[PDB]
Symmetry: D6
Subunit: 166 residues, 12 copies
Amino acid sequence: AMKLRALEYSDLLFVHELNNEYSIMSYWFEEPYESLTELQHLFDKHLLDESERRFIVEDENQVVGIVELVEINYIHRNCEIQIIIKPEFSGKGYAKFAFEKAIIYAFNILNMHKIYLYVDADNKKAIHIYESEGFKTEGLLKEQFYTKGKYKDAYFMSLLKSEYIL
Amino acid sequence: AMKLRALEYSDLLFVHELNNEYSIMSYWFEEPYESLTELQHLFDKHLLDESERRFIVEDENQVVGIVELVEINYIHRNCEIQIIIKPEFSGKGYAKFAFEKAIIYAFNILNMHKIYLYVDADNKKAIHIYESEGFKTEGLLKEQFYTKGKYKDAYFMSLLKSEYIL
Amino acid sequence: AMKLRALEYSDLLFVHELNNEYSIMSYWFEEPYESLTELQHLFDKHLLDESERRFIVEDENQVVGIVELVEINYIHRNCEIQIIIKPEFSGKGYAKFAFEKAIIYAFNILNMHKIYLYVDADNKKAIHIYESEGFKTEGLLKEQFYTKGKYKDAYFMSLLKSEYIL
Amino acid sequence: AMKLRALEYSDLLFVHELNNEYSIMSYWFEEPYESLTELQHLFDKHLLDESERRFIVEDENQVVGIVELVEINYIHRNCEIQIIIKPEFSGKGYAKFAFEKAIIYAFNILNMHKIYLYVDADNKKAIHIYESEGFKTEGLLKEQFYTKGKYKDAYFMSLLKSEYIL
Amino acid sequence: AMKLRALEYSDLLFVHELNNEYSIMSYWFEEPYESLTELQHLFDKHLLDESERRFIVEDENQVVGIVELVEINYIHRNCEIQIIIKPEFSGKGYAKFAFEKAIIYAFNILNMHKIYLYVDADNKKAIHIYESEGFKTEGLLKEQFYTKGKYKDAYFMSLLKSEYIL
Amino acid sequence: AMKLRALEYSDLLFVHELNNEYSIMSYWFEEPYESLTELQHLFDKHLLDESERRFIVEDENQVVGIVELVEINYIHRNCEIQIIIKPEFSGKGYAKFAFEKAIIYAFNILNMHKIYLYVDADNKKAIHIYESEGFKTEGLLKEQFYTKGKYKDAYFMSLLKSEYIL
Amino acid sequence: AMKLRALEYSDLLFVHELNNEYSIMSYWFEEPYESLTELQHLFDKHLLDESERRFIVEDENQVVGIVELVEINYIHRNCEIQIIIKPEFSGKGYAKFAFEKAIIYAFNILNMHKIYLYVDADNKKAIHIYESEGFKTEGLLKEQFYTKGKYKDAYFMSLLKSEYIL
Amino acid sequence: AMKLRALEYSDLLFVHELNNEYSIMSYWFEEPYESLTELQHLFDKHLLDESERRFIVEDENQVVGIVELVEINYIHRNCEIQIIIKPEFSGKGYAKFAFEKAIIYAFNILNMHKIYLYVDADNKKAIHIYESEGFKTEGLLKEQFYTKGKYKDAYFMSLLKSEYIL
Amino acid sequence: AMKLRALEYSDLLFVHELNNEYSIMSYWFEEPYESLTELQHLFDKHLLDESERRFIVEDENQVVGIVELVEINYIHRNCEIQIIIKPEFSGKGYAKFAFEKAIIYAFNILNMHKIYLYVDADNKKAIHIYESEGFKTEGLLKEQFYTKGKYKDAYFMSLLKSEYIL
Amino acid sequence: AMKLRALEYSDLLFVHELNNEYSIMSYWFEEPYESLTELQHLFDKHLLDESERRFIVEDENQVVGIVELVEINYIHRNCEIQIIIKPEFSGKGYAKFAFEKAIIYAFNILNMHKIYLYVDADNKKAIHIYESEGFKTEGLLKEQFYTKGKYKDAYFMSLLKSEYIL
Amino acid sequence: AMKLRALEYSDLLFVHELNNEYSIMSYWFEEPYESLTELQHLFDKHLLDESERRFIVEDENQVVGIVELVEINYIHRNCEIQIIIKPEFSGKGYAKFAFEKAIIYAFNILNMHKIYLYVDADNKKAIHIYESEGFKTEGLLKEQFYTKGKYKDAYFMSLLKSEYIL
Amino acid sequence: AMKLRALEYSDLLFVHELNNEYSIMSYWFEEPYESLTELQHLFDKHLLDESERRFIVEDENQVVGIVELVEINYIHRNCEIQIIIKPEFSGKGYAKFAFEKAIIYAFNILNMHKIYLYVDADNKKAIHIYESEGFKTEGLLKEQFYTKGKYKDAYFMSLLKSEYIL
């Protein structure tokens, strides 16, 4: 049984470890962190800020990933979604599950109108997870991110609640 | 033997767990929380605020629920009542007991004039608990709450101390 | 030319004066005030709280009233509306104007789903202003407010954006 | 035209002067003060405390006195009333007016059940003002106050809202 | 061997428990508390305030009660006395002892002139403990306290040091 | 002679006025403001935050607009540009000038790689100013902004420094 | 007409000047000061401390001196009295007046049992003012104060309220 | 082997216990305390204040008492000495030792000119300890202390360094 | 008569203006500023930091420039020198004077061993001012600074006190 | 397997020990430290400052060194690199590895343009590690550092990303 | 008529100016200052520190100098004296006067045992002022101060109160 | 193997004990302490103050002493040295070692010009340790320190780096 659970202070080591698996710099409420000690301090600084919301993805046996809703805007009713699954659990349907649940949370709980994400235009496996959840490409943002010594293009993809309920 | 006991800091894990059993977002002194860590911080922020009062419902063996009096107003002498019983204990009369005791607390201890609540107009089992304690419907508030992807209607129900003592 | 303008610190004397024209106790972010000095201190305490929003109603010559949106909830997308016009300006269409503009602000700017208000069930002139803006009665809340030595009944009235655009 | 007006920070010099006309030590939220500078600092410390409420008594031309409701208790619904009129205005009906208005405020606005006061058992002129407003003696508290080198007896007098409305 | 001992932080659980045996709301330096967690926070806030003084009543084996001197006034030299003995120890002379010692403390240590108390006019067993220590009734304060759904009358009783030493 | 000048505290009234000319809600370091008093407080809170940079556009006679660089990211080296010219000065080349200077500042001073903006897909006059400065459309973000009661589509447009220097 | 008036913040220049007329170091709540700037800062630090109480001695035309009650002890009910009259006003009866009034304040207002003072055993003119108010010598404290390069003896003198009322 | 050792935070329980053996109220830097919890808080408040200095009197086996130098004045070079020995150790020469050492500390380390003390004029055993260390009576301060229901006379006794070295 | 004077708070407008004459970003204690309002806040933050020292260069009629010693290191005894003269005063010998005086201050007052600076390798007029004061080139730091859209090379130049005194 | 890992609070003992192996004084965000206790306090003060970034160099068995990027400048895009390897691990290729990884981090992650370092002109073994990573000497800074009683010359060496990718 | 007056906050401009007449760096409570703005901030930081004491030297017409007692030690009873007279007033006997008065203050008011000073061994005019007040040389501290590019020798001179009174 | 190690927080008990072996009062950054609890609080207050520097003297088996450099002045480049060795380790060469190392630290690491000390003119064993390290007497400061009831003379001794390297 998988589930999404709200992120606690005690989750931050996992968060740190997961993001450490990627060379791209990591942010907590738009402030950068590279260590667990930085992450703990940013966590306490932003503790009641509603612009981001995070969930731990679990099965009964362990924590397997994180769902982040960020740039949550309650006027325009949209937010950016980021999901990271431990790479050792790829293809096991944790990403599909996390997506399904987070989309449901954004639309049916938070009452968002639209959700969007950015994805490296070379990350075919991620794009396919996104596409299977109904995300559509709305933009190709050239040289938008600098990663591993190169500026890379990113797709802006999005999902409208109205498309979601059809 | 059942009893109501004042909520302590050490009760917050139970509070967190109970509210986690419901998809509707949870509030502490009108500030939203989804994690235990948020709940602990809001608890300390509002520690001496008299606008809400909370009790843990117990039997000798465990904690079984929570009674909340909120929006307590000492001029107009009314407050909103919220009671949540662990769903595994339904039909065991904990809800009836919690109600009876909280109404007594509101009227005979706090000196309230009126108590009211909101209930989803589809929640027949809850409405019947309320009706059996003498709550009357005063309003049908259409599309007042957004829950699980739909705007839902709620009854405003209320109990006057004067009706209570008859 | 009438207009709504965002409330500044320098508006608080007017706010104080206006609310002083009514015996019912006045609140700023749910904290009571009776003097300008209390109002100034509550203003600074709640300066960036988004749960209430206030506008000054003006014509070119003077400030004539206040529009308050309170209990703003960005999940359920509803808020309570309060409008007070200086009694010397009654029947001049400032109330109609203030209403029209605040409803527009709530729906088209804030993206609310529903707006509601409470009104003493004897206040026929107010109720008629409300009814002319499309508010419908959803409830009759008996003995809900204590005013001038008596518990008084209030109508809960509301307006759905969906009704508004028809 | 007389009126009661809520006490502002700018009233504190008057408050200081008035209380200075009496040898008995003066208190602000149960903390003693003898100077204006102490009074200003206590005022800011207790600015949002609801246990006391104070009004300035005025005619169109000047401030003539102060009404204080203290030990306000919103559970038992009673409070202690203190009224001081500038001695130069005695017999002009400012005391009667202040009383009438403060009683009305306590009962009909604050929803108190009972109001009480203490008065030196030798202060016949004050007692008669009290008696004319319906206060009844409930106690004779011997040697309760030390004033001008002597312990003096005080009457506890009170007024029930139920008596007030008959 | 019985004794009175000054109240420590570590006594607050006992204090909480004892006051929990009574439906009347409990106060610490005139601020209400219902939980141990509230009591701990009020304790630290008022730690060096001399307006109240509290003692734990003990025998060699356990804590059996609390003595409170409150509203201590060092100008008029009087204070209010409250004593609560665990109901399981009634009739064992702990109340008599606590009284005797607290009166001695108030008069001979604190140099008070007068001590007083309030007691529900129906609480014959308490009144008799008071009367046996020389308290005299000075007032009958009608409908002064709201308890268990009813306004109740209280006696004001008092003891003068001058009577005490005769 | 036109020029760009760094924004001072004393510019905030102009900033407030300018943004007040538009119904879309205004932000300072991603926190919303509608009044000058809110803007002043956010200004002091974010005074040394380098994620946004703002300039006042002037001619010798008056302030005519504002240039904002926001979401400045010094790793990926891109930022979002917002320019607002007083509508009374449209077509006078202040927008062209402001653009030219801000692009120069972003690229040649801040060393950005890319600049981007969002524009309502119906705002032809703005789009043409952008296009004349070399911005290219990279995306069409449907229903991305809620404005005047409707979700509206926005173009994401961008300019690469490499294109700029050709 | 002479009078004693409570010391305000605005009195501190006078206080500074007066004490500057004496080589012995000056104290405010037992902390030393030599300048007005030090005195202002100590004043704010000790603003609500009840261990000292100070009055300005005036005639209708100017401030002529200061009365200080220090080391006020409300258990043992005694305090130390210090009075300084501008030396230009000596023999005019300001010292007698100040004494008379301060003694009255200590005994009849503050309820002190005893007042005492220290005086250089060579200061015959001061001692005679003291003796004329009924102070008696209780001690000769040798080499107790170092003044102008010499250790000097001081009389401890005192007045009992019981002697005062005979 | 006896010795004096500087008082640490961990000594405060002993300090509390010792002072608890006496009915006279106890002070820490002139602020009263009756509990260990009050004593701990006053200790931290006055941690670097040089007006008092305290030592624990020990033998190799236990703490047996406390030496306090208070009202230390570095201009007039005198201080008040207080010594309390556990009553179970009386007559064992701990008081003589503590005295001898504290006098040596005051004169030879702190460079005091004079040391003094107060003693109840009935406390013959204490007076004899004092007299044996060369203290001389300089005053008889009548009704200076209120203890066990009576005002009591105290001797002021003192020792001059010049007498000490003869 | 020229002179160097220590920089005051009131100099910051001049500082702001001067640095505004250059496109390179400006720093105060290594924190960037572009406005006077930022500069004022950084000034107060770093008010007693000894790592930088600044002087205003003046003639009798006006302020003409600024001397900055930064990265002052009191172990290695070296610091970086920056001098900016208003461009309207070039060739008038203010730069020579400022240099001469600041070098004297660094060596003879601060006891530095070495002073150094960085200069754009194209800034011949500056280099010649430096060379005329005895600075020698020690390095050519390629692409060290990004200015006006290009990475530029800088000379590191330095002066040893030992060379200075020859 | 070697790796670089972000520095945590728990790394500071290692950091302290390593720097203790060198007589040159050590800095944390340009503030000097010699003890672990100083280092811990500076660590918390600078916790979110982005001007320095530090990594621990490890193999599977232990921590072997530290990589520091300091004076990070995101406008000019350069930073100073410092690497210290435990001297017991010299010649084992930890320095080469640390270099390779930190250069990669600076260029490909942080997007720096240039990296530089300072090295004592006598430290041939270090210079050779630097030279093997492509650092070139750009300057010889004479008497720039005072170490072990002598002013010593340092090479400024640097690496351009453009050279790095060739 | 000359006099010494205690230094006020408003004296700091004079203090700044006077010390500015000397190249040696200036200190306030051992913290260096070169500007008035630094001096004002140090003044407030050290406002109640008794280790230094300062007086302004005046005649009826203007302030002419400053007397500083520093390193005041109340155990060893000695302090360092610094006197600076405006150089335009040299030879007018202000230095003699300031000395005479400050010595009197140190010995007869502060009860110091010894006063000392340091003086450049070349400053014959100062040394002669010192010698005429009875200062004796106790030491020649070679290369003790670095001034105007040279290490200079200083005399330590001192005056014993015992010599002073002979 | 002996060594000097930087003083940590955990060293303070040793520091306390060592200084306790001497009757002369002890200072931490010129603030007096007699207990470990005072020392801990002063330690945290002065944690980053560079005016004093302290080392623990050790052999492999235990801590044997402390080296203190105080009054460190980085302009005049001199400091005062204090070394205390546990008296049980005298004559074992710990003092010689500590000296040698601290002198080396002051001169070769801190770049001091001169080091000095004070020593009781009767302390021949200390003076000989000093003399053997090249300290020369520059002054005889009579009655400079009050110790064990007597004013004592001290030698000022010093060592110039220039003498040290010969």
